[PDB]
Design a protein around this ligand. Structure first.
Ligand SMILES: NS(=O)(=O)c1c(F)c(F)c(Sc2nc3ccccc3s2)c(F)c1F
Ligand SMILES: [Zn+2]
Length: 257
């Protein structure tokens, strides 16, 4: 029953998932002036050379590109992180218009979209167990603005017509997610949560400073997706983002400046 519309949208989530009003909820606004530079934070390590994508899926809330996480292939490590975390999927959140769509904001700025590359802590042996742990997940967030095309995103955009409606999937092999990374790896980092139900407070958030650009035609194709299933009255998949939640005590750290 949860979703993004008037009657089931984020402001309604706490009824089914009371952790919605918890102490480390995401996303947040990144106040770039109150974030603490920390010279002791390590460079992020993104080792994606051996990634193996398998499938793309419309789950009724976004689309996921899934990876085979059964060995140490695509991993995140270093940065603020203690273990190594394995890539399991990526997805995006986007707007009905270019002026909105991102979940994190930067001094109140909303970007057109936000890419989430979701990884899990190897010491918990799988994603299902990792989410019940406070340091179970690491999500690398990357902001999208509209301007020039991202060539590396086009294979994703071209297959979306085949997964139009809730439930649909398609084989999605040899997709290289290094094609979605900006040039710099400068980041902010803070402790928080899944930004969809079940809203578990299990995530180390790593948000890149440098957005990637995508074309208006790329983002327009995200907006032709559907929340509904093939049976049903079309609701376009747009504005599937949660807004910024209270920071409460937490401190946001910066890798830079
Ligand atoms: N916005 S987010 O990166 O915090 C996020 C995520 F990490 C995810 F891993 C997912 S999919 C997901 N599936 C399950 C299954 C069981 C328990 C928690 C989750 S989150 C998700 F939908 C999502 F929005
Ligand atoms: Zn997400």
């Amino acid at each position: 029953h949860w979703g993004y519309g008037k009657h089931n949208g984020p402001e309604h989530w706490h009824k089914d998932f009371p952790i919605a009003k918890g102490e480390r909820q995401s996303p947040v606004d990144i106040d770039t002036h109150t974030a603490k530079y920390d010279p002791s934070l390590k460079p992020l390590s993104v080792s994606y050379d051996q990634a193996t994508s398998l499938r793309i899926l419309n789950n009724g809330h976004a689309f996921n590109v899934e990876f085979d996480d059964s060995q140490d292939k695509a991993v995140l490590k270093g940065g603020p992180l203690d273990g190594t975390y394995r890539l399991i999927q990526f997805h995006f959140h986007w707007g009905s218009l270019d002026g909105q769509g991102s979940e994190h904001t930067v001094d109140k700025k909303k970007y057109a979209a936000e890419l989430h590359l979701v990884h899990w802590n190897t010491k918990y042996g799988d994603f299902g167990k990792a989410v019940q742990q406070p340091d179970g997940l690491a999500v690398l967030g990357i902001f999208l603005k509209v301007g020039s095309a991202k060539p590396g995103l086009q294979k994703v955009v071209d297959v979306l017509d085949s997964i139009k409606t809730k439930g649909k999937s398609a084989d999605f092999t040899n997709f290289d997610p290094r094609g979605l990374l900006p040039e710099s790896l400068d980041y902010w980092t803070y402790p928080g949560s899944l930004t969809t139900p079940p809203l578990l407070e299990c995530v180390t958030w790593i948000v890149l400073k440098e957005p990637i650009s995508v074309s208006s035609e790329q983002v327009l194709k995200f907006r032709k997706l559907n929340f509904n299933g093939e049976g049903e009255p079309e609701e376009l998949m747009v504005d599937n983002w949660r807004p910024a939640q209270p920071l409460k005590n937490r401190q946001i750290k910066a890798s830079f400046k």
